[PDB]
Copies of this chain bind each other. A is one copy, B any other.
Amino acid sequence: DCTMYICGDSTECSNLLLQYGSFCTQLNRALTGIAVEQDKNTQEVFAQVKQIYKTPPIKDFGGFNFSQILPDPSKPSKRSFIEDLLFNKVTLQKFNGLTVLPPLLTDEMIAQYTSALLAGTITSGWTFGAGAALQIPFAMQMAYRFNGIGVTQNVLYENQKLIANQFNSAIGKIQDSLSSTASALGKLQDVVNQNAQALNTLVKQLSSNFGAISSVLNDILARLDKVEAEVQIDRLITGRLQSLQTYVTQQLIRAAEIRASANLAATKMSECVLGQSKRVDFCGKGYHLMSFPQSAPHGVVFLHVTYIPAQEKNFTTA
């Protein structure tokens, strides 16, 4: 609330602030534009699927064990288990006129969307992303994933137990890592920190003098004659306005750099999750097979399953 950050309750200040015109309208309207784009980002990333596919209770996914990745009904938000690890690992109105608008999609609804994208993926492969969902046994769509990388599908079927046991183990390596280490989610944590640290600057700037005889505007109202009082207030508001303008500008820059990450996450959703990507190292190192999204706080985590050659043997060729 630009008028409240700058002037507070002072009518005497508010009668000066009107002489600066529509700076407070710009500062309000820019921040509301940043605010709206946060909902656009979250919709564009997650709401790529128009029918909420229920997870089938049969859970006969060819020996693959998605129990970490699929929802847990024992949790009130019905997050997955890895979604709950991520939620915990991103650790963290006022007199100054700041207020913290909530997002449009709750932390449940984005977890319902990830569950829809995931339950569609494992039951119907790519097909739900580009038409009606076509059910297929998971062993067979995996053999399509294998055939897509150019490993003949029999190499899946003849090794299905080994492939399933490798994958199930690798999900354990994720869960253990995201449990134990602190440093993985730094890419989310940095954005959380920068927004908090930007406000801690914005509020502490209220203690600056900017050349005024006091930083507490209530002093001047009580202690100076009207002409000198208004001059000393004009000193403060010129500084507090330029303090608030510096905040809004850097929030415009951050919102553009997050918009560029929302667009990328929406493309990884479209191409890694709803599909299979031939684009090298786009959907993780190795050849891409399939990816599973998980809704970290104000972010997304893609579990890229990839095929990596091993035990290279020399041969003569012609």
Contact = CB atoms under 8 A, between A and B. Distances in A.
Interface stretch (A169-177, A218-226, A305-313): A305-313
Interface stretch (A63-71, A75-83, A105-113, A207-215): A207-215
Contact of A134 (B274, B286, B309): B309
Given A140-B317, A201-B26, A210-B20, A281 B131 contact: no
Given A127-B309, A256-B256, A21 B280 contact: no
Interface stretch (A4-12, A93-101, A243-251, A292-300): A243-251
A190 to B, nearest CB: 10
Contact of A130 (B253, B270, B285): B285
Given A204-B21, A207-B21, A281 B271 contact: yes
B280 A211 contact: no
A260 interface: yes
Given A204-B21, A208-B20, A249-B249, A281 B48 contact: yes
Q: How many copies does the complex hold?
A: 5
Given A19-B210, A19-B211, A22-B204, A270 B275 contact: no
Contacts of A201: 22, 25-26
Contacts of A120: none
A130 B48 contact: no
Interface residues of A, number: 61
A205 B275 contact: no
Given A19-B208, A131-B309, A275-B280, 11 more contacts: A21-B208, A130-B280, A130-B286, A132-B310, A140-B317, A256-B257, A270-B280, A271-B281, A275-B279, A277-B280, A279-B279
Interface of A: 16, 19-23, 25-26, 30, 48, 126-127, 129-132, 134, 136-137, 140, 201, 204-205, 207-211, 239, 242, 245-246, 249-250, 252-253, 256-257, 259-260, 263, 267, 270-271, 274-275, 277-282, 285-287, 306, 308-310, 312, 317
